[PDB]
Amino acid sequence: QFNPYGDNGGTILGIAGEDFAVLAGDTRNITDYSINSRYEPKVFDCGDNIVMSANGFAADGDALVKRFKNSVKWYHFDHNDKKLSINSAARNIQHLLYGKRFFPYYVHTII
Amino acid sequence: GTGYDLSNSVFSPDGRNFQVEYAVKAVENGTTSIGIKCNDGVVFAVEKLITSKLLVPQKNVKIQVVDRHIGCVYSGLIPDGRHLVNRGREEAASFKKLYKTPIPIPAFADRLGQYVQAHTLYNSVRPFGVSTIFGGVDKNGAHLYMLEPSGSYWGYKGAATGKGRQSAKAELEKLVDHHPEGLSAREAVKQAAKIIYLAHEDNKEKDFELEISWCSLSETNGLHKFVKGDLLQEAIDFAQKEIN
């Protein structure tokens, strides 16, 4: 039987300050007990001053990050380049995730 | 009765489809494009009307490539030619996928012909407003074909369509009579340049830009390549020297 999921390790961490926020992630990508890459970044700038990271299954995380970047691109397209607020991005990501409620993204997400 | 020419796929009392002939009229009003079958390949040439000097030269390409061995040029409504070339590319792709070998020129010709002819069976679609000269080299050698808006296609030693199709055809005919042994690839390229320059007289009001491609078994290894660079200038010089 084919298992459509995998674990690629890693760890991310976000902390909010008074007028700043930080999103950090380790640059290690692994499979089982092998190191796939010692530098494979998983925290990404998505524009509109929003950083995002989906950690867990590297394929699902890359797919989710791509979909959210495309979502911000088309949000600019459809709303006169309106800045995507952090809460608007969070809600749009809730809908992106729940779209696969029955084939989930095996990732924990932090923006 | 009357009114037979208003709808497509309607037979007139003389057995004609007038919409197809109107498409042919639209074809004849297009720029000149020719094809020459030589001993081991084919050459295609086309006149590009430089409406103004704001047009970027060497761009706005008209000759299209199907697979890696088929060359197609057309006279008439350029968008219909692009549509037909896209359909032919899909046909060649499916043929390669199923039968592994690249599609032979007669097979590709019949694909295009069936498509164009099907576009003359229903009043819900418009006939194709292009004439197409295509061909290339397959396992059986070199093949040149011309396909009309009716879906009728034939194999040609040389073909021409567009405004200057008359003179060009005549010139082409002389070629067939002058060398029954055949032309070489570069000779056919230079001759196509000359023939395009000669057929430009029927469109002498606007300036023109020559465009030549070829598919030769020895010169291009069976692949379809645009004649560019030094060979293009050599053919242009041969044509210009032939005019004066």
Partner: protein, 244 residues
């Protein structure tokens, strides 16, 4: 395209009439006359065969009267084939109601379903309507004996006595003259035969030129009888329309 040949069958006239419905009613006006009469203890359907000949077998012929179930019959006026299509759908709907509720379908429900089927063709689909008028004679526990009519528009109405087809004005005048509420089924048979003999287009009214049916209560059940040619001849000689 193809819209030029579209007759646009479901459009309104500037007076608010459906062209095809009116023309189909005009068609039905030339069909053989059919009469239904609802007596106090039965219902009678009579109809004239427009198609008649010396070589036409009548024993195996059913042109105007049809069984829908065991308690409902129809007299048809117009295109017999459209009538058969509608009759098949009506029989199927009656059996559907039976399978669903384990009860015989009330006559008005069947009439309304068939009339809705007719109306659908007059509002969408771009098809011609059904050139058929129906006279439904039925029995149910809720309303007793019931007599309905439905024309190509999808409209249906209930009558004590009614006629469809040819010479509806004359037949309706005669029925309005000679109909009384307390009459019995035999009196209704007599009145139907008399009206058909007075409004027929033929010389005399013969047995081979008629179809006859009676839905009556004779034993605690209702019996549906489609008259055979001999029964028609007998009932004709009994009311004094024929001899022998």
């Amino acid at each position: 395209g193809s819209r030029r040949y579209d007759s646009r069958t479901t459009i309104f006239s500037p007076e608010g009439r459906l062209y095809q419905v009116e023309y189909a009613l005009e068609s039905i006006s030339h069909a053989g006359t059919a009469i239904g009469i609802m007596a106090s203890d039965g219902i009678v359907l009579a109809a004239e065969r427009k198609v008649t000949s010396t070589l036409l077998e009548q024993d195996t012929s059913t042109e105007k009267l049809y069984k829908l179930n065991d308690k409902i019959a129809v007299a048809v006026a117009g295109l017999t084939a459209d009538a058969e299509i509608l009759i098949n759908t009506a029989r199927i709907h009656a059996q559907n109601y039976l399978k669903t509720y384990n009860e015989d379908i009330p006559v008005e429900i069947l009439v309304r379903r068939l009339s809705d089927i007719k109306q659908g063709y007059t509002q969408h689909g771009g098809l011609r309507p059904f050139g058929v008028s129906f006279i439904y004679a039925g029995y149910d526990d809720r309303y007793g004996y019931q007599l309905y009519t439905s024309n190509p528009s999808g409209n249906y109405t209930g009558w004590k006595a009614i006629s469809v087809g040819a010479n509806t004005s004359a037949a309706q005048t005669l029925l309005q003259m000679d109909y009384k509420d307390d009459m019995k089924v035999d009196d209704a048979i007599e009145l139907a035969l008399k009206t058909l003999s007075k409004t027929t287009d033929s010389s005399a009214l013969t047995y081979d030129r008629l179809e006859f049916a009676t839905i009556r209560k004779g034993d605690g059940e209702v019996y549906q009888k489609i008259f055979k040619p001999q029964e028609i001849k007998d009932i004709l000689v009994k009311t004094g329309i024929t001899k022998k």
